[model samples]
Target: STGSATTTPIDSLDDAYITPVQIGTPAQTLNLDFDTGSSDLWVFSSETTASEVDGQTIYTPSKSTTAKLLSGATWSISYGDGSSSSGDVYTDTVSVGGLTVTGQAVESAKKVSSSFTEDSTIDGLLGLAFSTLNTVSPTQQKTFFDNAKASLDSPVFTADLGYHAPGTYNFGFIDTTAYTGSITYTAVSTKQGFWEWTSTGYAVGSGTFKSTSIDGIADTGTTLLYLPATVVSAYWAQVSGAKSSSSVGGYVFPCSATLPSFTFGVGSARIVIPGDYIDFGPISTGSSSCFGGIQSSAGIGINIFGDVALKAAFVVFNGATTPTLGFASK
Candidate 1:
């Protein structure tokens, strides 16, 4: 049987999506960020220092009869933005939607970075990345999806992330009704534990599509779309008042600047990102300057099709064989 979960946007933060999940016996529910970029199902727990815990909910293993401590096991994770969390491990019954997995590794956080502590809405993260990227000590752990795949009717899941709205994530089956037109499939390389693929080319506005190949990852955890520096420069050149602001950290433009649509090639299909979506809203409240959602992936060394790009299409993370990505217009 297939299971499905609804992900809702956080207030003012269009970068991440949160879904409710159940853990342990009696099922303690928590709001978890379904991050496709990293592997490690970690949460704020009773082990967390009181000072470190703000408005976030804490998971208490002692309250759950099915929660078993993974003695001597631990986990530590650091994100690209420097946000980090480290914790002890426990095996518990974890469930997403109606699908449940027994003995799921649940990292209980003892310490977390200021970034996570400040973002109190998210109690934890449910990683959708490959199991090989799990950070548990001594022995690696499988992700909830990996552990539940064999029991699923099909080994596939679809991410229908929306624009300033709620979306659905379906597991074990694809809902053809969720997207318009036919789905286009492309092979992915999971060597880096990411949904990495090469786009044939791209175009700024309505310009001709270039033939340059760009390698990038489809990351649901990331908020903005990142491309090569050259690509970013070219796109911004089309915007009259666009400029690079170090203080703002990326490309910023006049709030009134007319933005153009960006399109990327995927096999025989071309996924188009609307012009308005490229304008990531004002850099500061009531400010006349707006940040460009498309930025340079220079230091990161790889492009990222973040929420901004993903929301423009319906994406399928097919784990059936060799790992393939399917995209279609929403």
Candidate 2:
């Protein structure tokens, strides 16, 4: 049987999408961010310091008869945004949608960075990246997808992330009705523990699409679309009153600016991001300053096609022999 689930965006933060997940016996439900950029099913738990646990729902392992410690196993993870979490490991019954996996490794967070603690809405992260990226010490852990793949009718999952709306995450099957046009498939190099691929090039507004290749990853965890420094500058140049803000930490412009569309090349296909979607949101309530959804990936080493880009297309994460990525307009 195939399993399917829906994800919703957190208000104001538009940076991540969260879906419900069940852990341990009797199924302790928790809202988790399904992150494609990292691999580790970590959660806020009773082990976490009381001060660190704000509005989050913590996992109480003692209440679950099926929960078992993994001896000396532990996990620690840090993100590009500087958010981090670490804790001991427990093997418990974990399920997403209708798919259930027995003895799944659940990292119980005892320590979390301020970034995570401040965002009380997200209870934890359910990593969907390659299992090779799992952070369990001594013994690397397998993600929920990897542990349940053998039982899936088709070893794949589709991400349908919407903009300020509800979207669905389908597992073990692809729903053709979710997208329009044919799916453009591209070869993905998974050696880096990410869905890394190369974009043929990009264009600003009606400009010619350059042939320069860009290597990047499809990351649902990241909020903005990060490209090379030069590309980011070119896009912002077309907008009036746009400038790199050291205080804001990215490109910001007057909320009244008329933005242009951004397009990227994937294999023989081109995916276009509309101008309106590029305006992430106002810098602050009732403020005339706004942040650009597309920014420079300067110090990050690799470009990131984050939520800003992913929300514009339908993505298929293929797990068949030699992993690949499929994209289509929604």
Candidate 3:
């Protein structure tokens, strides 16, 4: 159970891939990439303007044959990773793994930058994460979760990131076959974006860096783990001869010694991030060795546990069943 999911290359980006899904009756096939950083489902459309839709996958509304649109309303989203696109809002029949659900909210973007347009095969992105991180406000917009929450086969949404290999990203509810009869469920905090829960506190090695208190949240959209300034500074203090590198980044420390283990306490559950995740060789931009594990982002809104943390646990997104997230062992 400790390994990577094998992924199929649907486009040019080495990090991007696609999942096959059937949305509604007749099970129309749609191409989408699994994204953990945000929760929102969108696609390219025929109505999209040439300037906006170039180089991206376009979903022919007439192609679905069984799908329908919400009509008139338009939408747009900008991701944290510096990618942005805009599209009209529509509703249609959608399915995944023979699980058909009708009236799925689909975003047809008109303007997509080269970063997204360059991917010839990647038609759209399927946000498998929580709803809180939705680029659009839920109060005004009903996302795919809001539309399909009532009719799924199970109350739980399981993403089986099939064998796509290490470093390759594949997203979706694969299948529940990996569950070994025990499922640990975590309550979803009703906030924006993904189901982010506050961390009790953080610590470095055995040192009393930060008090063992609750003060952070867990996010799946991010790729790396980010901590608060206080905890990061304290952790860096233990990294032999750690020193302030610059404002663009935090402290740069020597990697010659074994980095300390950082532990985060969330509710009753404690998650530990090993040293390998934090340590990295000096980037081409700097001469100092960059600290690997913990990073300090004082002004940044919240502490993100990211993929580096979730890979250690099985996350069950029960959106179709009950708009809740459940965690279990692989």
Candidate 4:
């Protein structure tokens, strides 16, 4: 009826968050990124080129008695980071935390781009976005969530990503103890196959909520919170010596500079990100300038409420017939 897993940031930088997943009959465990912005359950596998495999664990489907090749089925996906992966497809029993899905499409990486190979922390990615975005050809595949939603007490899941600590991801039901205050629900625009929604308003520190609509996706896959240029400029202006820099990437300010709290409204619920969260970390190893956690979403087309925003609240990905998103303060 329910399933849960502990997701942890790989390092102090909080660059990536991952959880363990079990695959095949004998249960080959591997660390995976639970990304909601894309739909492709792909992995570094035995089918992958030997030169492409770094220190990452590969899913050897040949060892699983239940693994069956999906003849002629193949998948190719492009990520927002410009990295890409193309692979052959197989059907196997997959398990995440305590939930299990039989006949789940498991895409084995034949070849992946540089970014995927460089990250040894994650062996694969378990996409939680709608199956409509799945890249499998000839016959599109359903995600693990979609295949198991029927067996869940409630067809929903919650993400509680932490700053530098371990957070829990719960499925089937929302535990009230996980959060404080009431949850505010927002209608999702599933037309784009993302958990895209419109925010009611936003404010910089103690400022009043500017009544403007900011459309974005609740993307757990991404690292920082991305907003419009106007919003980022307004927030950065409060901090002394803040300026946009290309070398350091995005905006940077004095490391000792104090940052103002950033706030966004989910209809009526206010989720505030503390100042320290925005400070992020230094530009480099021991640089005096610090990089910002909140940056302009320019050129990104749609804004993204990535980990920086999601970490401040408990987010529910409600998968009802008419999908919606629920946000609650912690």
Candidate 5:
């Protein structure tokens, strides 16, 4: 099966790229965050509390004729913000674009944290990470991509996120017309349950590429790029007044600072991110201090190649037996 799902940024920051997903027999559609950093496919549904519902769309499992509750099955997951969403599980027909999966696990939210309630963008998240990361107890369920892989022409999915516009997520096949040159491929280490890979090197603008291997995860869920402390410090050092401040959002610089571009190695190829894209706008509405799009991974446990870096290239998550990741320049 082949499916090309349409995605759009939920806000100006382009933090969360959401795709509409159809769940159950009656076709209740809800926008879901297509995150490569997670594995659980959960949603706000009829089972969610009124206080947690806010104004986002809900999935009514009761209305779907094919929705069957999984006996004694429950799941829960937490976010870096300490907020969480948890609920019981069910199996139903789920489809994205035209790619459909029967008896797909759908976790219905019984309770959601305040963080998700006020930020009304996506109804829930559909993780593309390995099923080993799934939080369901007793019976772990496979991700939508995992369940649909066997039927696909190719066991891979591609993400082409736009800088500030809408993007597309392709399942089963790669879009040859969307990229240029050859796609650099790398082996992904799923040991940590993430699309983690080793980047060959990095370069600050026109500088020569630093020949060092940096292990990081290609996470679509994260908003900014996080690298080793030294990398971020070096990138900021290029800016005359750019400095790291803990009080203000990590690395901050003057709005007038003209940042140099950033590039990271992907096998034989490298992807360059424009300076403006790394400027995450002002820390405050009219403040002169602007938050940097790249931060230090010193305290973040693991280095992350988030949207700030991934948006610069077309990424493919190859989910075959031996998983791999591909990056292409456009």
Candidate 6:
């Protein structure tokens, strides 16, 4: 989901931001990632030199008067994309829109490597997806929700994803108006980093692949959807009528005509992915008539519905109230 999901570029990365609540004062304006797979807050800082920082956005404490480092503790994160960064713990008052809260935990990176250092557009990650996978420990929990939860109308946050346009994903409070369909909730299984799950079945066009059903996991960490080898082969077999070519180690079919509408239902929340997403021709690896979907991940057994599927649903993950997760149509 990290690199797999399409990015809706913001006009000015500087204009996009969040606020962190402090203990005694107004919340500080901080940048956040709307990350669904992992829950953690991090930012760039003054101490970081550009050589080590590379392409990632860096936040400077000099810009904010209330920014304060946390004791002497240092923090670092490594994503599945092989990117890594290190920063010292810091405290700051942060704010977003009209919301204000304080005593929020912040990470000020001192060194950065991998894609984080090369892609310097995003300043930080907000992690509004789920609370179960929070990277923050009990002692270091940030106040994005801890402070604002009591004041919200629902004591909940909602992401209104807007693409390439403004508000690709809007957070804070669920908007019932977004969906007229029914909503559903699913139970959560205890798992580290990942909120492990099992798929009941899958569908493509008008065909249902019943035999491919297996225990699967939904991860915001993965970008593209992943399926079992048998299932992948079966899906390809259905599209064998279209010309196909190999790219990114996966077979890409020709034209949007070759793909069909596909949907996956988790509990009662069914996520639909458009056939246009499989268009792999523009990448120089294939012809314009061809598209791609199934890619090989070696021996990995679990199927993953990355951002492509998540974008179509409002996923609620709870750890504080109960060990459960809920899904609803966005």
State the TM-score for model 3.
0.70
For each candidate, give its TM-score against the true structure. 0.98, 0.97, 0.70, 0.98, 0.98, 0.76
RMSD of each: 1.0, 1.1, 5.6, 1.0, 1.0, 5.7
Model 6: worst 10 consecutive residues (lDDT sum): 1-10
lDDT per residue, candidate 5, 1-330, as tens digits? 899988898888787789999999899999999889989999999999998888899999889999999999999999654779999999999999899999999999999999889878889999899999999988999999999999999999999998888989999999999998889999999999999999998999899899889999999988899999999888998887998997885999998989999999998789999888798888889899989998999977999999889888899999989999999987
Q: What's model 3's lDDT at 330?
A: 50
- Count of clashing residue pairs in every prediction: 0, 0, 40, 0, 1, 44
How does model 6 fare in lDDT? 0.53
Model 6 clash count equals 44
Model 4 misplaced stretches (Cα beyond 4 Å): none
**Error at 256, model 1, angstroms:** 0.9
lDDT of 4: 0.92
lDDT of 1 by residue, 1-330 (tens): 678999998865476889999998899999999988888999999999789999998899999999999999999999988899999999999988898899999999999999999998899999998888999998899998899899989998889988879998888998989999999999899999998988888999999999898999999988999999999999999999899999999999997789999999888789999988787778889999999999999999779999989989999999886899999997
With a 3 Å backbone cut-off (N, CA, C), the pairs that clash in candidate 2 are none
Each prediction's whole-model lDDT (CA): 0.91, 0.91, 0.57, 0.92, 0.91, 0.53
Q: What is candidate 2's TM-score against the reference?
A: 0.97
